[PDB]
Copies of this chain bind each other. A is one copy, B any other.
């Protein structure tokens, strides 16, 4: 079988998100790193066995793919599609490589990132760097438990991993990243009950609102998508809080994995463009996307055979 990257691994207490573009004539240096990335992961990771839980997921953008590789392309790989809604906008920003680094400790993440960037120095330009941290009982900056309804086990495997529909890239996945900044002043102006109506779940207990009470423009309502078969379309989210108190930055770093970008994009469209019953996702009234990129995260063996 093909061996996937750690795209199915659970949420950790620390994360580093690193997005870079490949400079002119940097292809060679990048290809060398890509073949050594798993090697670097073990080099750092083994030091903190067995509680370290260091992993790195490497993603490659659409434009970057053509510059790096000859032959077949992943069927669903394309640039992030900008969504200009009536009120809210999902922007597309540059990104060739994604490094999604997770561990139970930030030091492990930072050490690995140092090794990666040390090898890439002079071949890449950094676009974005976010240091994520767990906030209390798995909460986001809005004060709600975040990640509850992530699929697990076989359900996760079927939702995330590329299969027979694109057999040359089986074991791969698609990652969509968006950096969100929150308007905390406005958010804290709402009552808890009002906030619950925005999300679609109880704040403290994380219990889902009943279908009779759950608004149609609530986050949970709009991101609940059924396919033609009537089965649920699911994504795996590894969102992390981040921020800077001085600059009044309180953020959610969104990352979602899916076997096809169509699933994530459908959810994006419902959020930004709305449905017949909802103008847009109410969460966006308190959340601004400042980045937006799409990457293909190939199977581990693909990177190694370079």
Chain A residues in contact with chain B, CB under 8 A? 1, 3, 10-11, 13, 16, 18, 20, 39-40, 42-44, 46-50, 105-107, 110-111, 113-117, 126, 128-129, 131, 133-138, 143, 145, 147-149, 153-155, 191-193, 201, 203-208, 243-248, 250
* Copies of this chain in its oligomeric complex: 6
Compute how far the CA of A18 lies from the CA of B138 in the bound complex, rounded to whole angstroms.
25
Compute how far the CA of A149 lies from the CA of B201 in the bound complex, rounded to whole angstroms.
31
Most B-side CB within 10 Å, residue of A20, A39, A148, A155: A148
Contacts of A244 on B, CB cut-off 8 Å? 129
Q: Contacts A126-B246, A204-B204 given: A47-B138 contact, CB under 8 Å?
A: yes
Contacts of A246 on B, CB cut-off 8 Å? 18, 20, 117, 126, 128-129
**Given A46-B138, A49-B138, A129-B246, 20 extra CB contacts under 8 A:** A11-B49, A39-B208, A42-B149, A43-B208, A46-B206, A106-B106, A107-B133, A110-B135, A110-B243, A113-B245, A115-B205, A116-B245, A117-B246, A126-B245, A129-B244, A129-B245, A131-B131, A136-B137, A192-B193, A203-B204
Q: For the complex formed, measure the closest distance between the CB of A151 and the CB atoms of chain B, giving whole angstroms.
A: 10
Compute how far the CA of A115 lies from the CA of B188 in the bound complex, rounded to whole angstroms.
12
Nearest 4 pairs between A and B by C-beta?
A126-B246, A192-B192, A129-B246, A47-B137
Contacts of A191 on B, CB cut-off 8 Å? 191-193
Most B-side CB within 10 Å, residue of A40, A128, A136: A136
Compute how far the CA of A193 lies from the CA of B42 in the bound complex, rounded to whole angstroms.
21
Contacts of A3 on B, CB cut-off 8 Å? 153-155
Tell me whether A206 and B129 are in contact (CB under 8 A).
Answer: no
Q: Supply 17 A–B pairs (Cβ within 8 Å), ascending by A.
A: A11-B50, A18-B245, A18-B246, A43-B201, A46-B138, A46-B145, A46-B206, A47-B206, A106-B106, A107-B133, A107-B134, A107-B136, A111-B136, A128-B246, A137-B137, A192-B193, A192-B204
Compute how far the CA of A237 lies from the CA of B212 in the bound complex, rounded to whole angstroms.
41
Contacts of A50 on B, CB cut-off 8 Å? 10-11
Compute how far the CA of A3 lies from the CA of B158 in the bound complex, rounded to whole angstroms.
13
Q: For the complex formed, measure the closest distance between the CB of A102 and the CB atoms of chain B, giving whole angstroms.
A: 12
Nearest B-chain residue to A149, judged by Cβ: B42
Tell me whether B204 and A143 are in contact (CB under 8 A).
Answer: yes
Tell me whether B204 and A49 are in contact (CB under 8 A).
Answer: no
Contacts of A111 on B, CB cut-off 8 Å? 135-136, 205
Tell me whether A154 and B243 are in contact (CB under 8 A).
Answer: no
Point out the residue from B10, B114, B248 that lies within 8 Å of A49, measured CB to CB.
B10
Tell me whether A205 and B113 are in contact (CB under 8 A).
Answer: no
Tell me whether A137 and B48 are in contact (CB under 8 A).
Answer: yes
Q: For the complex formed, measure the closest distance between the CB of A85 and the CB atoms of chain B, giving whole angstroms.
A: 30
Tell me whether A46 and B245 are in contact (CB under 8 A).
Answer: no
Nearest B-chain residue to A137, judged by Cβ: B47
Contacts of A113 on B, CB cut-off 8 Å? 245
